[PDB]
Symmetry: T
Subunit: 67 residues, 12 copies
Amino acid sequence: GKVYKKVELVGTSEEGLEAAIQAALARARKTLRHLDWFEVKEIRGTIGEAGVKEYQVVLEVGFALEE
Amino acid sequence: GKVYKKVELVGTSEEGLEAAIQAALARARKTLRHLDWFEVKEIRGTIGEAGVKEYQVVLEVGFALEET
Amino acid sequence: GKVYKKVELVGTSEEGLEAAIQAALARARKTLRHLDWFEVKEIRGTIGEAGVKEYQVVLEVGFALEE
Amino acid sequence: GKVYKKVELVGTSEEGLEAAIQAALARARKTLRHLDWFEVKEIRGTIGEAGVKEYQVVLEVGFALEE
Amino acid sequence: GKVYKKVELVGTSEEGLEAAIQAALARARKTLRHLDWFEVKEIRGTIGEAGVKEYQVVLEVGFALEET
Amino acid sequence: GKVYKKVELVGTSEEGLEAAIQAALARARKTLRHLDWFEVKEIRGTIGEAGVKEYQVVLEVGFALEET
Amino acid sequence: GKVYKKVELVGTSEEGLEAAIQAALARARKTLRHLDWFEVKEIRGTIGEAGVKEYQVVLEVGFALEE
Amino acid sequence: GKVYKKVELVGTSEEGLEAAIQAALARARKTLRHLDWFEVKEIRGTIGEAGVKEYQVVLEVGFALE
Amino acid sequence: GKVYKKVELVGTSEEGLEAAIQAALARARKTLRHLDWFEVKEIRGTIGEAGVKEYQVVLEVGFALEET
Amino acid sequence: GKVYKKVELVGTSEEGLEAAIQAALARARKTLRHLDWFEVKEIRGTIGEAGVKEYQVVLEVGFALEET
Amino acid sequence: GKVYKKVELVGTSEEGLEAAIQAALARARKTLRHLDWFEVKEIRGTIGEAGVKEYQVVLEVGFALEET
Amino acid sequence: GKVYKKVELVGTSEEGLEAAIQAALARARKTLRHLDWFEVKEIRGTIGEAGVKEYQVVLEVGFALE
Ligand SMILES: CC(C)(COP(=O)(O)OP(=O)(O)OC[C@H]1O[C@@H](n2cnc3c(N)ncnc32)[C@H](O)[C@@H]1OP(=O)(O)O)[C@@H](O)C(=O)NCCC(=O)NCCS
Ligand SMILES: CC(C)(COP(=O)(O)OP(=O)(O)OC[C@H]1O[C@@H](n2cnc3c(N)ncnc32)[C@H](O)[C@@H]1OP(=O)(O)O)[C@@H](O)C(=O)NCCC(=O)NCCS
Ligand SMILES: CC(C)(COP(=O)(O)OP(=O)(O)OC[C@H]1O[C@@H](n2cnc3c(N)ncnc32)[C@H](O)[C@@H]1OP(=O)(O)O)[C@@H](O)C(=O)NCCC(=O)NCCS
Ligand SMILES: CC(C)(COP(=O)(O)OP(=O)(O)OC[C@H]1O[C@@H](n2cnc3c(N)ncnc32)[C@H](O)[C@@H]1OP(=O)(O)O)[C@@H](O)C(=O)NCCC(=O)NCCS
Ligand SMILES: CC(C)(COP(=O)(O)OP(=O)(O)OC[C@H]1O[C@@H](n2cnc3c(N)ncnc32)[C@H](O)[C@@H]1OP(=O)(O)O)[C@@H](O)C(=O)NCCC(=O)NCCS
Ligand SMILES: CC(C)(COP(=O)(O)OP(=O)(O)OC[C@H]1O[C@@H](n2cnc3c(N)ncnc32)[C@H](O)[C@@H]1OP(=O)(O)O)[C@@H](O)C(=O)NCCC(=O)NCCS
Ligand SMILES: CC(C)(COP(=O)(O)OP(=O)(O)OC[C@H]1O[C@@H](n2cnc3c(N)ncnc32)[C@H](O)[C@@H]1OP(=O)(O)O)[C@@H](O)C(=O)NCCC(=O)NCCS
Ligand SMILES: CC(C)(COP(=O)(O)OP(=O)(O)OC[C@H]1O[C@@H](n2cnc3c(N)ncnc32)[C@H](O)[C@@H]1OP(=O)(O)O)[C@@H](O)C(=O)NCCC(=O)NCCS
Ligand SMILES: CC(C)(COP(=O)(O)OP(=O)(O)OC[C@H]1O[C@@H](n2cnc3c(N)ncnc32)[C@H](O)[C@@H]1OP(=O)(O)O)[C@@H](O)C(=O)NCCC(=O)NCCS
Ligand SMILES: CC(C)(COP(=O)(O)OP(=O)(O)OC[C@H]1O[C@@H](n2cnc3c(N)ncnc32)[C@H](O)[C@@H]1OP(=O)(O)O)[C@@H](O)C(=O)NCCC(=O)NCCS
Ligand SMILES: CC(C)(COP(=O)(O)OP(=O)(O)OC[C@H]1O[C@@H](n2cnc3c(N)ncnc32)[C@H](O)[C@@H]1OP(=O)(O)O)[C@@H](O)C(=O)NCCC(=O)NCCS
Ligand SMILES: CC(C)(COP(=O)(O)OP(=O)(O)OC[C@H]1O[C@@H](n2cnc3c(N)ncnc32)[C@H](O)[C@@H]1OP(=O)(O)O)[C@@H](O)C(=O)NCCC(=O)NCCS
Ligand SMILES: Cc1cc2nc3c(=O)[nH]c(=O)nc-3n(C[C@H](O)[C@H](O)[C@H](O)COP(=O)(O)O)c2cc1C
Ligand SMILES: Cc1cc2nc3c(=O)[nH]c(=O)nc-3n(C[C@H](O)[C@H](O)[C@H](O)COP(=O)(O)O)c2cc1C
Ligand code: NA
Ligand code: NA
């Protein structure tokens, strides 16, 4: 039957975790169709003088391959 | 000594991660007593027109068992 | 080359996940210099009458060792 | 929003892996509604004089909780 | 064929690891039948003035489902 | 020496596990050359009226990269 | 009490997963007694013109030690 | 340099975890020399009327090859 | 809110697992305050003429950080 | 903010582990820009008459996506 | 079809990682035939006055079983 | 009995994995005594024009507490 592909992206944001996830998905939507689900693999980030600099959310994004 | 049970729930929300966790715990409190801690096992979700459609947080919820 | 150290902290907050992460980092910067990155190992928490009582984020914090 | 529960079952069969999975799901269907997805956690089994005696498939079954 | 259910319990005891496991299994047998095997998932515990306060053993318990 | 790429696909089938794997590989062969090995990462699926609706096998597929 | 040993084998078959498992167990029983249980560790395989060339199932086989 | 072998055994005991580990090691020493270290991989067991029937400790045993 | 630190210790004992855990915690309390919980990461050991020589329990110990 | 892509490669070399990693990165830089970091996932290899034939290093490579 | 066996060895060397792997494989080929692949499970070692004393590479070695 | 501490360090080197491990251990020996064993947890690194820029070996270092 149907076949899906999963790609691993890292979304980033200074604002928070949801914003980082949304950034990855917004970029994926620019070029990929039939985006269906995501899976967070890791949460990492950088540190600056005020604490978190960048939140970095590593996620897999699954999409249906067209026929 | 005391014995606990852990149950695996999936909370969902369109709003965010915290809201998804809170939804699972609010449902658990309707029928379970002595809810003590949770552990997030996975964060997953669905995708729609605006990016995230539903955040889905898979968590274990630990509660103390009453004596029989 | 240079050497880094990683320490494991648990930040807590009633407010949310980001707040718990920031609490750990704020404590770290009181005494540690050259804080560079973090890795979330676990998200846990406690439960009370309002649902989540404390969010607890277990993270590794990496920093460069001086000299 | 909606809340799901996951339960861990072990389906067994002398015939094969699919039969073991189907046995677990058939039993779940007797008493649970809104069964949605499954995740295989482990494949194990017993050995007899002719090789595999019983295939044992450990799986999580997710279902939507009714309101 | 036969179907088993696994449940995740946490047994606790001040006395030791075996005692913590036994506490979980004793509670399980008050209400569950055909208990067959267990799997330890984690060993944790709390700390007090004299070292270990409670040993806490997280384990899966498997039991055969009755058939009707 | 040689360099390979691994891509993560999900094959699906109503028929079984082997059929789901085969579906992923048949699709991969339409556009990729030098397909060499696969690794099953997960087995998942959906549930319907007759039990399993779709078997979903998540696998990594390794292929040798051609020189540029 | 009694003691068991576990050995790691890889069964292969062009036919399917069950056949690969059975091939490993058939080889094991030629020389090992008191074969009791198996645990699948990995499912892998090779690819050729027809899709799957060989299914390869990595499993642990547990047996009771005599005496 | 020196090469070690690891084998995976499962010791059992009705009494406890240490006894199960010791049972595996006692059997290993009957036929294997230069036993050096062990690693517990899993703790499992069976259930009976008294609670635990058998503790089953799965462990890797490392020994120096002669 | 409150911040905790985790440190990784290895307790050892010829006597058993509980004794090895207790040895790590006894040493920890000589210098660390507000010790709260532990997590066993690994159980390992050495072998001698009579079987187990030393039990070695690798554990994480969590403690609440004092606020200055 | 900025978005990165990770791809999983397997570099190989008869010479050693570093050479296997370098082979993957050399191939990646022929076609990918803004390569930033890598993560080794597995070390494997093949065996021949004289011991190691090929070292095989499975690694994730992260690169920053260009923005338009 | 064909059946393989995997055995777990630890190669050691003062020189480096490749040398430790090669030591395990050199010993394996003294007694085992049809050695095909290896998988590194762990890299560990001992420490002495000058840093690394022994590199210790824990690996699985797979070989094809002869058919009688 | 005896108690050990483990600390997690990241050694780096442009040259290779062994050199990165040795850098971490050389730094540890400046201030820590009774260094006994290490465990590699991760191998990561950065990429530059020459391929690898820095190898980064994350390792646990175990030492006996005095
Ligand atoms: C169906 C299900 C989701 C409904 O859950 P629920 O909304 O919590 O409703 P329940 O019937 O379980 O109610 C909770 C019960 O636990 C009791 N309870 C609550 N907290 C407790 C505690 N800490 N200690 C002991 N008992 C407690 C409640 O009193 C209530 O018992 P009662 O109805 O006898 O008075 C749940 O029962 C379930 O997941 N069952 C498992 C299904 C399964 O695995 N089936 C096998 C298919 S093969
Ligand atoms: C800052 C840091 C990196 C410096 O490490 P360092 O180079 O070893 O410097 P130290 O001053 O600690 O020297 C090592 C100490 O261990 C002692 N020591 C060395 N070997 C020892 C052994 N085997 N057993 C017991 N003590 C030993 C030394 O004598 C010295 O003791 P002293 O501080 O009482 O003089 C280290 O202290 C650190 O990682 N701190 C963690 C801080 C932290 O996590 N902060 C909380 C943030 S929220
Ligand atoms: C208790 C503890 C949390 C306190 O942390 P702390 O407040 O940061 O104090 P530390 O001395 O450890 O670390 C801070 C020091 O590191 C040094 N330092 C900071 N950043 C550094 C860096 N990048 N490189 C080198 N040194 C650095 C500073 O000199 C500082 O000293 P200061 O507070 O006077 O400015 C910490 O020391 C600890 O985890 N100790 C427990 C150790 C243990 O495991 N005990 C054994 C039990 S069996
Ligand atoms: C004993 C057990 C296996 C029986 O499972 P079961 O046959 O599915 O029966 P349950 O009562 O749990 O669940 C069925 C009930 O859930 C309810 N239900 C079914 N689907 C539901 C859904 N989607 N949402 C909410 N409720 C649902 C129904 O009311 C149903 O009753 P019904 O079958 O008459 O229609 C299961 O309840 C169990 O594993 N219990 C373990 C208890 C335990 O862990 N004890 C602690 C020992 S220390
Ligand atoms: C609350 C809870 C811990 C209480 O467990 P408990 O003390 O074992 O009490 P139960 O009411 O479940 O009794 C055990 C049931 O299992 C049945 N049972 C026992 N062994 C069985 C077996 N081998 N096969 C089938 N059924 C069995 C018993 O007959 C009994 O049902 P009965 O009262 O209808 O005869 C347990 O029911 C539970 O974990 N439910 C959680 C509900 C949940 O997850 N809610 C959703 C929150 S969002
Ligand atoms: C969209 C997608 C699924 C379509 O895959 P596809 O059906 O295989 O189609 P492709 O365009 O990739 O065709 C395969 C290409 O690989 C080449 N190729 C096949 N095997 C090869 C090999 N072994 N070595 C080198 N090149 C090979 C083919 O010649 C073809 O190249 P060409 O069109 O330049 O001639 C796939 O391109 C993809 O998943 N891209 C990644 C998307 C992504 O991650 N986006 C980021 C969002 S933030
Ligand atoms: C059957 C089995 C459990 C019996 O184990 P055992 O009690 O140790 O019996 P053994 O006869 O092998 O005795 C141990 C051997 O190791 C040797 N030995 C002991 N310590 C040694 C050491 N440190 N270094 C090298 N050799 C050593 C002994 O001298 C003896 O050698 P020998 O057979 O040449 O006389 C064991 O052989 C086994 O697990 N076989 C695996 C078979 C298998 O996987 N089959 C494939 C199925 S598809
Ligand atoms: C090569 C190998 C696969 C051959 O396996 P095998 O054909 O089963 O031969 P083994 O002697 O090991 O095991 C079979 C023996 O175990 C014994 N045995 C069988 N079941 C047993 C049980 N339940 N309890 C005790 N002994 C048993 C039998 O006496 C049998 O001898 P037999 O073939 O004459 O009937 C196996 O011996 C092996 O894995 N060797 C490699 C060891 C190694 O790691 N080498 C070091 C490299 S550095
Ligand atoms: C470079 C890269 C990040 C760009 O990703 P991208 O912006 O999404 O562009 P892609 O060409 O890969 O994918 C988009 C194309 O996929 C196709 N596509 C989109 N959705 C699809 C779907 N559901 N099914 C099939 N095709 C689809 C479209 O034709 C699309 O072209 P379009 O955007 O003009 O409409 C991505 O291709 C990549 O990661 N490549 C890595 C290459 C690599 O690993 N090299 C080996 C180094 S050793
Ligand atoms: C086949 C494959 C390995 C070839 O990889 P390749 O040698 O890198 O060649 P590509 O054609 O992908 O070239 C790299 C592309 O990434 C783009 N790119 C490089 N770095 C980039 C960056 N930092 N940001 C955005 N794009 C970038 C390049 O510009 C180029 O696209 P262009 O030719 O349109 O300019 C690779 O495309 C691939 O893995 N696709 C697999 C397809 C797949 O999974 N198919 C589904 C089977 S079911
Ligand atoms: C002790 C041990 C390390 C010695 O390893 P070794 O030096 O390779 O020596 P072995 O005795 O195993 O000899 C290798 C055997 O494999 C056979 N062999 C080699 N390659 C083979 C292949 N590809 N296919 C089939 N057989 C093969 C050899 O011919 C030899 O058989 P033989 O002894 O009947 O002549 C190893 O046998 C072992 O780990 N056994 C321990 C058993 C155990 O776990 N004991 C139980 C303790 S509780
Ligand atoms: C060497 C070491 C094992 C000694 O541990 P120790 O016996 O507990 O002794 P410490 O020097 O850490 O003293 C404990 C400190 O924690 C403080 N403390 C205890 N509990 C505390 C708490 N809950 N909150 C805050 N501080 C606390 C103590 O007051 C003491 O501080 P002080 O030294 O300023 O008086 C430990 O400090 C260590 O592992 N450091 C190694 C650093 C390292 O990694 N070196 C870099 C090598 S590359
Ligand atoms: C990340 C984390 C893990 C914890 N794990 C356990 C546990 O294993 N068992 C337990 O009884 N308490 C556990 N606790 C609770 C603590 O032991 C302690 O009771 C609580 O944090 C209050 O500590 P304080 O009074 O020092 O603030 C955990 C707490 C945190 C922050
Ligand atoms: C489970 C398993 C894992 C394998 N892993 C690798 C690998 O890591 N790298 C590789 O080049 N070949 C790998 N192979 C291929 C084998 O090394 C070998 O080439 C193949 O099984 C043919 O062996 P034979 O000629 O002895 O039958 C693997 C094979 C199996 C069965
Ligand atoms: Na040596
Ligand atoms: Na001791």
